Amino acid sequence: SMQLNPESADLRALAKHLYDSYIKSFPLTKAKARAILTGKTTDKSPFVIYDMNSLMMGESKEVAIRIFQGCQFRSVEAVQEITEYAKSIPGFVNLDLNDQVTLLKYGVHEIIYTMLASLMNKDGVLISEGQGFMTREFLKSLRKPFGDFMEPKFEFAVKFNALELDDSDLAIFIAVIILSGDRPGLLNVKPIEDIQDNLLQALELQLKLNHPESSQLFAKLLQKMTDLRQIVTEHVQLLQVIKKTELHPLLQEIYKD
Numbered sequence: 001s002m003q004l005n006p007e008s009a010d011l012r013a014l015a016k017h018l019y020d021s022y023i024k025s026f027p028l029t030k031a032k033a034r035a036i037l038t039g040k041t042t043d044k045s046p047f048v049i050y051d052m053n054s055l056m057m058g059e060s061k062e063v064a065i066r067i068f069q070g071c072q073f074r075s076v077e078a079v080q081e082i083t084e085y086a087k088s089i090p091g092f093v094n095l096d097l098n099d100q101v102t103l104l105k106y107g108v109h110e111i112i113y114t115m116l117a118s119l120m121n122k123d124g125v126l127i128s129e130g131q132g133f134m135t136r137e138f139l140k141s142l143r144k145p146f147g148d149f150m151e152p153k154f155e156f157a158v159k160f161n162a163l164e165l166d167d168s169d170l171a172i173f174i175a176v177i178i179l180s181g182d183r184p185g186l187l188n189v190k191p192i193e194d195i196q197d198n199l200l201q202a203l204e205l206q207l208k209l210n211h212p213e214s215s216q217l218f219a220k221l222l223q224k225m226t227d228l229r230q231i232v233t234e235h236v237q238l239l240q241v242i243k244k245t246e247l248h249p250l251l252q253e254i255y256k257d
């Protein structure tokens with residue numbers, strides 16, 4: 001932040017641009033989520049699924065299957081949302097279409113887990129764009145091996161939510177994730193890394209401006225990009241299981257290779 005000059009003003013314009021398209025691409029923001037989770041919102045208070053009884057009034061193996069079929073459904077519409085946003089990242093549509101598909105191939109699950117944290121508190125998660133709330137302990141209590149399917153998310157979210165990012169912060173963060181230069185099968189790492197470096201400059205200036213009394217928030221955020229890789233691997237391992245135990249075409253395209 002040290003200087004107010006043309007370079008720092010471009011980085012603010014890039015942050016504004018990302019925020020606006022974020023707001024356009026993501027109906028349920030962290031600000032709206034935090035409002036629903038605190039009772040303040042105008043929107044009719046969401047129904048709380050906390051046991052088998054409350055799940056029935058909301059709508060065993062059938063209870064589990066149904067829940068995971070919604071998570072597959074919402075995850076598909078979540079990929080649409082994130083596709084829209086990526087298109088708004090200055091530069092992104094000027095890379096080999098192959099690289100674009102790649103960057104998004106490996107990106108969506110990391111963003112999903114990132115933005116899922118926005119919908120979470122200690123007690124549980126907002127579902128169906130804020131109309132429901134499903135508790136951590138209920139999800140936990142589901143038949144093995146689906147029973148332990150969100151716990152990693154809740155664990156991630158607890159530590160992620162303690163950073164106290166807002167929508168402005170997350171917009172740039174989410175862009176930094178999509179423009180990851182280490183994804184398999186990238187043709188041109190240079191142009192990708194080049195955009196990410198500018199995004200990383202915009203994030204840093206954003207975190208300095210937005211979190212005055214917040215030590216190494218930049219470093220801690222970049223370390224979260226490490227937690228996310230690990231979480232995505234552990235999901236895949238869990239689905240490598242369901243294959244033998246018990247997805248959606250576009251999720252199958254992403255899980256392949």
Ligand SMILES: O=C(NCc1ccc(NS(=O)(=O)C2CC2)cc1C(F)(F)F)c1ccc2c(ccn2Cc2cccc(F)c2)c1
Binds near residue numbers: 059070073112126150
């Ligand atoms: O928003 C949902 N889930 C978000 C989500 C996304 C991904 C995941 N994890 S994942 O899939 O592993 C990710 C990598 C791709 C988990 C969730 C979670 F539920 F935990 F929050 C949601 C939940 C229930 C829904 C539906 C749709 C139908 N059900 C039933 C119903 C329950 C209550 C009322 C009702 F009308 C339907 C959608």
